[PDB]
Ligand binder design. Sequence first.
Ligand SMILES: CN(c1ncccc1CNc1nc(Nc2ccc3c(c2)CC(=O)N3)ncc1C(F)(F)F)S(C)(=O)=O
Length: 261
Amino acid sequence: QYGIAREDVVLNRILGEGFFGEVYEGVYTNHKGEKINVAVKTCKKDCTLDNKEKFMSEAVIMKNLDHPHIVKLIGIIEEEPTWIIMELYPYGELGHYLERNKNSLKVLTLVLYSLQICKAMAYLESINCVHRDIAVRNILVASPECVKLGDFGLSLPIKWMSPESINFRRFTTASDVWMFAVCMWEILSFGKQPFFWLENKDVIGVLEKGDRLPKPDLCPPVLYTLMTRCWDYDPSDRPRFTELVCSLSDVYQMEKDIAME
Ligand SMILES: CN(c1ncccc1CNc1nc(Nc2ccc3c(c2)CC(=O)N3)ncc1C(F)(F)F)S(C)(=O)=O
């Protein structure tokens, strides 16, 4: 019996408020009778037609992605109220996780998380899917060994955005590359906010001068250089995610070798 019956899903606490509506914690009983902990995304009753269409449109994309480092959609109940049943990652947001665990985390782990997210982005890049919300608030911790890229950006996060996105509202895989490097900066900074010392209006001017985020204290120089390549003003000069996977794999190996693991 393929698909998901509503009776197979029991809701518990509210987890929070997403763009379309409330997200609940719950339990899904699958076809083997196993109890699976789930995050259940809902759409507000009083929302516009275009918002409902978009809720379902994004869900169908997520249903077709099956990547170890992208949040997993388990199923969709289309009949109103429409529920999108996701896998629950109870550790929650990576930014908060990093803050909490900063005194036990090794640099090799921070590079691992970067690499994992990079792998997900390399897959999206292969189908010219532009994500727009690659940031530690939108990465989920499945386990200490595994992070997952969250839902696509509602697209204002000026301090994460490429120059062309700020200047022209242009979003491409290369602007995702820019944002991914900002995410890496956040990770290596244990979840500090990029340009916390500036206001939004000031950013593009600084970026136009060639000024960039400074190297985080624990960031290996080799990795900082890679970040600065991602922040090339010209989108065409930025590495592609497929290139970054190879580069980050090498950085990861080096950090593991230095840590003797
Ligand atoms: C809480 N919300 C979220 N905030 C940030 C990212 C993701 C979500 C919701 N989505 C998910 N959330 C989780 N887990 C999760 C999250 C946030 C916390 C916790 C768990 C415990 C906690 O304290 N905060 N696991 C899987 C998913 C999913 F669907 F993407 F697969 S919200 C504002 O209601 O949208």
